[PDB]
Amino acid sequence: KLSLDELHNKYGTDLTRGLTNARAKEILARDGPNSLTPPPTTPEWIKFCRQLFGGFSILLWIGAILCFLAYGIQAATEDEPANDNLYLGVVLSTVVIVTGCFSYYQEAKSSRIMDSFKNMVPQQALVIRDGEKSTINAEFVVAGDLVEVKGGDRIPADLRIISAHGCKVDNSSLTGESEPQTRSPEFSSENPLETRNIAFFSTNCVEGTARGVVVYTGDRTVMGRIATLASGLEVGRTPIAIEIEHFIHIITGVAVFLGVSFFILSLILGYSWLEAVIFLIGIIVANVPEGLLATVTVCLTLTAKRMARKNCLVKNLEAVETLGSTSTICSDKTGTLTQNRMTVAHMWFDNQIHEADTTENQSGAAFDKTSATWSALSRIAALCNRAVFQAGQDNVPILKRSVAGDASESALLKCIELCCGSVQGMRDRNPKIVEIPFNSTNKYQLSIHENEKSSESRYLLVMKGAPERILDRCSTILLNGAEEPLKEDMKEAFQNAYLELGGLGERVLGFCHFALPEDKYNEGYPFDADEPNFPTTDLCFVGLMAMIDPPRAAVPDAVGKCRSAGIKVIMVTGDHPITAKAIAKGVGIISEGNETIEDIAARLNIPIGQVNPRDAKACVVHGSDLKDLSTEVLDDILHYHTEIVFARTSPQQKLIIVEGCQRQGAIVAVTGDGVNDSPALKKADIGVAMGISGSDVSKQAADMILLDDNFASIVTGVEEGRLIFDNLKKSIAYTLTSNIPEITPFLVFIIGNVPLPLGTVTILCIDLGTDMVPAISLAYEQAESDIMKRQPRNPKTDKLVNERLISMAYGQIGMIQALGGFFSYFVILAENGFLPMDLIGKRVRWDDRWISDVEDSFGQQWTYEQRKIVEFTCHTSFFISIVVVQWADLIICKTRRNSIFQQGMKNKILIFGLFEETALAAFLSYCPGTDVALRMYPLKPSWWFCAFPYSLIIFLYDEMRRFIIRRSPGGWVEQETYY
Ligand SMILES: C=C(/C=C\C[C@@H](O)[C@@H](O)[C@H](O)C/C=C/C=C\[C@@H](O)C[C@@H]1O[C@H](C[C@@H](O)[C@H](O)C[C@H]2O[C@H]([C@H](O)[C@H](O)CC[C@H](O)/C=C/[C@H](C)[C@@H](O)C[C@]3(O)O[C@H](C[C@@H](O)CCCCCCC[C@@]45C[C@@H](C)C[C@@](C)(O4)[C@@H](C[C@@H](C)CCCCC[C@@H](O)[C@H](O)[C@H](O)[C@@H](O)[C@H](O)[C@H]4O[C@H](C[C@H](O)[C@H](O)/C(C)=C/[C@H](O)C[C@@H](C)[C@H](O)C(=O)N/C=C/C(=O)NCCCO)[C@H](O)[C@@H](O)[C@@H]4O)O5)[C@H](O)[C@@H](O)[C@H]3O)C[C@@H](O)[C@@H]2O)[C@@H](O)[C@H](O)[C@H]1O)CC[C@H](O)[C@@H](O)[C@H](O)[C@H](C)C[C@H]1O[C@H](/C=C\[C@@H](O)[C@H](O)C[C@@H]2C[C@@H]3C[C@H](O2)[C@@H](CC[C@H]2O[C@H](CN)C[C@H]2O)O3)[C@@H](O)[C@H](O)[C@H]1O
Ligand SMILES: CCCCCCCC/C=C\CCCCCCCC(=O)OC[C@H](COP(=O)(O)OCC[N+](C)(C)C)OC(=O)CCCCCCC/C=C\CCCCCCCC
Ligand SMILES: CCCCCCCC/C=C\CCCCCCCC(=O)OC[C@H](COP(=O)(O)OCC[N+](C)(C)C)OC(=O)CCCCCCC/C=C\CCCCCCCC
Ligand SMILES: CCCCCCCC/C=C\CCCCCCCC(=O)OC[C@H](COP(=O)(O)OCC[N+](C)(C)C)OC(=O)CCCCCCC/C=C\CCCCCCCC
Ligand SMILES: CCCCCCCC/C=C\CCCCCCCC(=O)OC[C@H](COP(=O)(O)OCC[N+](C)(C)C)OC(=O)CCCCCCC/C=C\CCCCCCCC
Ligand SMILES: CCCCCCCC/C=C\CCCCCCCC(=O)OC[C@H](COP(=O)(O)OCC[N+](C)(C)C)OC(=O)CCCCCCC/C=C\CCCCCCCC
Ligand SMILES: CCCCCCCC/C=C\CCCCCCCC(=O)OC[C@H](COP(=O)(O)OCC[N+](C)(C)C)OC(=O)CCCCCCC/C=C\CCCCCCCC
Ligand SMILES: Nc1ncnc2c1ncn2[C@@H]1O[C@H](COP(=O)(O)OP(=O)(O)OP(=O)(O)O)[C@@H](O)[C@H]1O
Ligand SMILES: CC(C)CCC[C@@H](C)[C@H]1CC[C@H]2[C@@H]3CC=C4C[C@@H](O)CC[C@]4(C)[C@H]3CC[C@]12C
Ligand SMILES: CC(C)CCC[C@@H](C)[C@H]1CC[C@H]2[C@@H]3CC=C4C[C@@H](O)CC[C@]4(C)[C@H]3CC[C@]12C
Ligand SMILES: CC(C)CCC[C@@H](C)[C@H]1CC[C@H]2[C@@H]3CC=C4C[C@@H](O)CC[C@]4(C)[C@H]3CC[C@]12C
Ligand SMILES: [Mg+2]
Ligand code: NA
Ligand code: NA
Ligand code: NA
Ligand code: NA
Q: Would you call 771 a catalytic residue per the annotation?
């Protein structure tokens, strides 16, 4: 409740010149940037407690505790004790600590990449300083400067409206109601939230333009004070995640059951009540997989970094998964398909077609520049146009300089300045009184100006737009200079002219004008843009103007890839069905051979109505018919046609098409740029907002932001989206196989009563060696050729972890790695004197420190450490046999449909893993001192080869398993083993 003078006198500001740059910076440094502050959080404290002290590591923490107590009772009691317990504790503790460090290096990394994407797409407001308009980052606006807003932009700070032009804002986020409240410079209510002279933070200007003085800036804003609570906010969990968990739950159920079962087997066999609970605890801990979620989050984050390098920024992680399943892409033409760098080609007037483009000069012998009709046409183009040359281009040529405005007005302005002269004087010769702006719903631009004729003080009215709309507003035609009527002979010549200019892939516009009678509209009467002050019809059409705009380079290949993938492409354009049909013919939407109902009517020379609608694979629907049509007809066209093109479609219409595409049971992505589009961008599954030309509304309302505004970028993004899935399945498959060889020894040991084949140290060596680096390498795998030559996926029918993965890992591959390790075990014992038949039952006697007289097969007598040494040599051999079989498992994990001879060994990280693991096994087995500390003993040369036959069998089996898949689709192998 103040005035414009009181406001400018309180903060200090020129209503018509704004602030000065020096003063603006003085205030900018005086009170801090216009950006909210970060909220409270937990430091490394709660970050490390969850890592080193979580749920699975807790048990290891116990193992360490127990062992230390085992050493204390020893050193305190027994003279000259042993040290296997002290080193066991020193090893276990180091394992919990490392696992924690690795996990930390991953959790932080993801939390940082996400923060990087937030500054990729910052926000920039329009401020007026020293009398000039400039677009600066929202973080540089201060209190006092002048700020201008336009329908589609966001209010930067708390403004005080000083001048508005039918400006409306969406005040729904703050108080909650989306009806657009109009912002007027006058004051209306005592409550600041109800008055119209104040713009607010985070609001959006729906329609209109306005000016205002920044009253409040930074955290000193309404939503800033309210943010105390907003801080907490809310997040979510992607599908894939709730898929992995679910799995974990089932496995836990299976594990708890088996625990109780192994319990009854133990007591029916005579163990100690305590030994049965010890077994239950160990078995349930060994059946539940560990790591799944960490690898899913890391893989997703890394893939997102890969996608941002290829131009696709995602507002969240759920978009990374939905992009792969994409079935339909509803894209626009001017901005996505074409280049928006248009240029005029053919003009129509005096019932004649005229060419242009006088090579940046006055040559080319286009047409007599003297033509009267041409003077009128050149004048309306130069007058109704709203674009202007960018300041300081007095040096560059007429075609290569920079302009500000629509691409249509830019092409028009350049043609008129090259062969018609300076527009600023042409614009001052006639003074502009009232102008009405373009719009997609109107489809025309009009304005009235004074007439520079010193003998005629009347008013001139000019308007341009889609040739059909303008034709409906004319009853005369400027012909050869005079006026004539629009009868059917020239009406048909005009129709054939539209197809002539349209077939050339050029855009076409209509231009008309009319002399307003100064007797009914005097020189003093003001024609406010509210009611019908100008005769819409009865105008004088002067002539058409056409311009070219070509497609992108990579576009043809993109549509071809979509056709091979089993993806439908639809062109939704606001242009004509011809120009549409043409662009479609070029990009590849409408391939050769397919015809429409009109094509068949033309070939057969039969009425279009007689032709059978099912006979045509492709079609083109118009806007008027779409307005009239119902739901069943729409489903008919969407289901029966393969290539559908939509012309003269308004923005509000789009939602119906999207709802029809989803009714079928398909995932859709829509590209948007304006304000009317926003509703659609929310209903679809993937909202692609333009980054270059988009508005704050389109970006806030969408899931993804295209950084370059290219259609070819999308298809590449979907390729990146499918690769994530393929690699995730491969990695999980490689991790789950090692479970079988680690559990089978503890089973035969208890049931069969034989010496323990695998221990604690060796098992820890397996988990950390063959499952960490090779698994990580799998993520980096390349894409198999087939990636784009395969149908999309149905999330309901195809899941990540299904009953087939467990079939390949546990059942087929696993059992083989187990047999491979058992062979090395049997061989080591047989050679040292203990044969296989004599081994069944020796455990009871084997594990007794007191029987130094143990007798072997050849009759020798063994002490306690002499036999324990051979057992440890078996632990080391088992370990190596596991690394050897892992070689094969890893190689076969690279591809699931192609062979490795086809895919190739170009992955470097995977190779690194093979060499490094082999090195770890050789090092631990041969190093001089591991004996005392880790309990591993040297392996003789003839033993390393025991696992080789089992390693080759796995590779050959998978190779054939794949050949049968490639040859017989939908067969038994694909139904059963294709995971
Ligand atoms: C950290 C862990 C925890 C521990 C770790 C541990 O290892 C180590 O840290 C150590 O602790 C280190 C700690 C050290 C601490 C301190 C030390 O430093 C210091 C030194 O320690 C030394 C000790 C140390 O030297 C020791 O030796 C260490 C070992 O300890 C364990 C030993 O064995 C054993 O404990 C020895 C100790 C002693 O023996 C204890 C005895 C009992 C307590 C108790 O009985 C004695 C006594 O009686 O207790 C009394 C107290 C009472 O209140 C208690 C009440 C009793 C309740 C009764 C109810 C029973 C119950 C319960 C019901 C639920 C069900 C039910 C059926 O039974 C039901 C039925 C009722 C109706 C029964 C009623 C019975 C009545 C009984 C009671 O009344 C009492 O007995 C009674 O009151 C008594 O007073 C009385 O005397 C009674 O006597 C008799 C009773 C009978 O005896 C008794 O009842 C009997 C027999 C029952 C029998 O079952 C009957 C049967 C026959 C049956 O019925 C039968 O006939 N069947 C006939 C069948 C038949 O015909 N069939 C014919 C078929 C025809 O068709 C009599 O009968 C009764 O009448 C009479 O009343 O109710 C009281 O105090 C006294 O009385 C006392 O004497 C073993 C270990 O713990 C340890 O090694 C000390 O000597 C020394 O002085 C000290 O200085 C977690 C573990 C790990 O998770 C796991 O890995 C684990 O490590 C492995 C499993 C190890 C195994 O493998 C190792 C090698 C490698 C492994 O590590 C590998 O890692 C394995 C892994 C595992 C998994 C899988 C796989 O492999 C790998 C895969 C993983 C991979 O995948 C991953 C992915 N996630 C990644 C990767 O990791 O992980 C091996 O080395 C291990 O050896 C091996 O085990
Ligand atoms: C829980 C999941 C486990 C997964 C794999 C577990 C691996 C376990 C494999 C073996 C463990 C059992 C212990 C074997 C000891 C049995 C000894 C035996 O058997 O002594 C019989 C013969 C020895 O004859 P001799 O020359 O000394 O007699 C000479 C006679 N004179 C001279 C008078 C003419 O030994 C033979 O013939 C060959 C016997 C060697 C071992 C055969 C064991 C059974 C056969 C295949 C097992 C693999 C099954 C795979 C199943 C996959 C799904 C689970
Ligand atoms: C010290 C440690 C040494 C370790 C040595 C390991 C040796 C390897 C072990 C076994 C190898 C044999 C496995 C054969 C399995 C069948 C593979 C198969 O059927 O692949 C089919 C592919 C055809 O694919 P496509 O036409 O669909 O591609 C289309 C590509 N697009 C789409 C671009 C046109 O064929 C191809 O890629 C052509 C590839 C041909 C490779 C032939 C290898 C066989 C030669 C000797 C094998 C060893 C025999 C016994 C050895 C005992 C050794 C002591
Ligand atoms: C005693 C008996 C033991 C039996 C045990 C069995 C063990 C496992 C059995 C087999 C595993 C090894 C199989 C190796 C496969 C080689 C395949 C190959 O050669 O496919 C030729 C490729 C294709 O080329 P392209 O241009 O047509 O691809 C175009 C790709 N597109 C179309 C995407 C552009 O060429 C390339 O990949 C580029 C050249 C890559 C050369 C890789 C050489 C390294 C191979 C293995 C490393 C050793 C690891 C073991 C470490 C322990 C050692 C102590
Ligand atoms: C990637 C992760 C996967 C695997 C992770 C495994 C985690 C394990 C972490 C730590 C384990 C520490 C093991 C400590 C090594 C032994 C220390 C020790 O307690 O030794 C005690 C022995 C004394 O025995 P004694 O007197 O009873 O013998 C009597 C012999 N009689 C009587 C027959 C003559 O000391 C001796 O023998 C003297 C020999 C000293 C041995 C020097 C070897 C250096 C050890 C590690 C350095 C290697 C790091 C790798 C760097 C790679 C660079 C590229
Ligand atoms: C481009 C870069 C490629 C890199 C590939 C991997 C690099 C491989 C690195 C090293 C491998 C060579 C190892 C040579 C070691 C010989 C040392 C030796 O003196 O050893 C003697 C033993 C005999 O022991 P004994 O029990 O009779 O006497 C015991 C007598 N006492 C115990 C009383 C003393 O003999 C043995 O260990 C035999 C040793 C094994 C013989 C090698 C057979 C493999 C040959 C080629 C396969 C290479 C894979 C490439 C595949 C490419 C596919 C595209
Ligand atoms: C140390 C040893 C190292 C090497 C060991 C090598 C072991 C690997 C050897 C073979 C791999 C076994 C793979 C098992 C898959 C067989 C499954 C099968 O039965 O699938 C039959 C399919 C039928 O498909 P469908 O759609 O008509 O079914 C329609 C079904 N309904 C009517 C119900 C809808 O395909 C057909 O019938 C036609 C295709 C038949 C393919 C036969 C492939 C034989 C290839 C190699 C075996 C020879 C190895 C020789 C080595 C000598 C070693 C001493
Ligand atoms: N400044 C303008 N004034 C008047 N008419 C214009 C102007 N710019 C373009 N036109 C024409 O008005 C009509 C409205 O087109 P509109 O902007 O709705 O869609 P479009 O150019 O086909 O683009 P897109 O498919 O990207 O939405 C078109 O025939 C266009 O050529
Ligand atoms: C699920 C996990 C964490 C439970 C771990 C249980 C541990 C603490 C239990 C399991 C078996 C127990 C041992 C069983 C037998 C004996 C022998 C006795 O003379 C001293 C105690 C001692 C050595 C016990 C100590 C505690 C012990 C090691
Ligand atoms: C350690 C040993 C004794 C365990 C042996 C486990 C074997 C028998 C288990 C491991 C994985 C299992 C398979 C897992 C999935 C399926 C798919 C289902 O539609 C039919 C059963 C089938 C094919 C299972 C059969 C039993 C199976 C092969
Ligand atoms: C392709 C297929 C059929 C070849 C199978 C070859 C079999 C018979 C070969 C492969 C590796 C070989 C083993 C390699 C090393 C040793 C250690 C030695 O001290 C005793 C023999 C023994 C245990 C061999 C026995 C024969 C063996 C198992
Ligand atoms: Mg558009
Ligand atoms: Na693990
Ligand atoms: Na959405
Ligand atoms: Na594996
Ligand atoms: Na594992």
A: no
